[model samples]
Target: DLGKKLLEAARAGQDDEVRILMANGADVNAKDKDGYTPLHLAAREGHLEIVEVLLKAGADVNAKDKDGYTPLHLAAREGHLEIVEVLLKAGADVNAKDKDGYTPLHLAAREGHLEIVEVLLKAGADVNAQDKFGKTAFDISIDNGNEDLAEILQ
Candidate 1:
């Protein structure tokens, strides 16, 4: 059963409460109704402290939600470069692909997050990972009207 208190703490970005819950034997890997773990919420909301708390509690940095989106994917999509760095440092897979075969780099590029693009690239993400439509990060950036990102890739 999903613990309401755990879910509420995560939603409210209460790092202390989450820590206490984990310390008191709550499953750090507990998934919510949508299959989102606290780590997912922390990353999506750009709460770096909460993310670190979750990670320290042994949350699976690679845990994928129903959509197959990992915390790395959420951080990338939101352009949370610091969170991305933290996740990467915690050994998160930089090349994890979603159900659609889209990598975090693809989303970062499409969203015009230049810092994230650089971070992923430096972390050795495949610059040429193709999505289901056979489109690369560069392709997605162009399609999304991220001319600066497109140019940077050139």
Candidate 2:
């Protein structure tokens, strides 16, 4: 129930309420039923303001959910460029691997989010980080038929 409340606040972009709750002892690191944090919800929703507020409130930028996806991973996967930038600036690990060892760059490239891929690469993401499948971002992009992204990674 607390997770639901946190997720709802994040999804609605309730910056003030979320901040107040966190300041008043709400767990900034609280995980939802799916293991997603308020930061993950904010990133997935493209709520840049809420993401910033949450980050400043000490939300763990590198916190991965049950899927081993960090806020950066979700933002990049969803093509939320601004949200990705915010998380990166907040010290999110660009090379942080999921359980499968896929980095944010891999997600962006595979999703064909070229702009997000560019941003991640520029931010020093490991284009060569291999997943459990031994595939790099370039390989994933190619497998996903994202020729443009694959080319960029080359």
Candidate 3:
């Protein structure tokens, strides 16, 4: 099925193939066994063009994969700030948490992507947000003991 192959094409950066398959009735939201989607693959690789196309084709911006991680979570975790902004503009919940209750903010802070953390904050991410352990983004920054990260977060 072309739908089944879309994720691979996206992962491989085959934008042309992605366009073709999508035009030929491929479902952009098809999930792999791990629950990854074409948008997730495209975002993961920083393929902004392909991601825009997928978003236009009605991909669910908030769809979570096997780990309860959405495209926003992936983009943020990877420090793909541009993709994160686009997903946020498309209505992704900045506060959305994975199964572990780790929001995009948590990942951004954990990865030490300060720019992403700032972007997420500007997008209205909760400063007081917490994960299952009741840890806040500020806590993550402080745990790194960077002091500067915690300062920035504050």
Candidate 4:
């Protein structure tokens, strides 16, 4: 269960465990039944240090889950600015889309993560990109009563 341990260690923010697993040849890109990789769990859980460990071990920053949610999407949605930046610097797709066509920008804006939204925008996110409901990030911002966010998106 070396691979599983890697995922667990990454998710639990056990940097030493992750490094040990990696040294033992565990797959850095191993995915769970839900298609969640160590990177995905680490990013979602705001394990910034673990994220760096995984990334250094060749984890796929852009690896997607069953719902096509990348590490960037998880980090952005969870408001982990540091993780988001790490993912982005590692070449995580800025415009990666999920099952519903929701981009990281959409998730960030939906959750009212103004700083993440700003970062996404600075990273060249498509402000007009739409989801399954055809709602852009800006539209969601307005609908969610995030006037400050909506204004920034404009």
- Give TM-scores for every candidate, taking all chains together and pairing residue i with residue i: 0.91, 0.88, 0.95, 0.97
Candidate 2 versus the native: TM-score?
Answer: 0.88
- Give lDDT per model, in order: 0.86, 0.86, 0.89, 0.91
Best of the two (2, 3) by TM-score: 3
lDDT per residue for candidate 1 within 1-154, as digits (tens), equals 3356776788688878877887787777888877898888889888888898888878899998887899999999998999999999999999999999989998898788999988998897898899999999989877888877877666
- How well is each residue in 76-127 modelled by candidate 4, as lDDT tens digits? 9999999998888889899999999999999999899999998998988999
Residue 21 Cα positional deviation in candidate 4, in Å, after optimal superposition: 1.0
CA RMSD, predictions in order: 1.7, 1.9, 1.1, 0.8
Off by more than 4 A, model 3: none
Lowest lDDT sum, 10 consecutive residues, model 3, at 144-153
Model 1 poorest ten-residue lDDT run: 1-10
Q: lDDT: which candidate is best?
A: 4
* Superposition TM-score, candidate 4 onto the true structure: 0.97
Residue 53 lDDT, candidate 2, scale 0-100: 80
- Candidate 2 structure quality by residue, lDDT tens digits, 47-77: 9988988898889999988878899989998
- lDDT score, residue 76, model 2? 92
Pairs of colliding residues, candidate 3: none
Better of 1 and 2 by TM-score: 1
- Candidate 4 runs further than 4 Å off: none
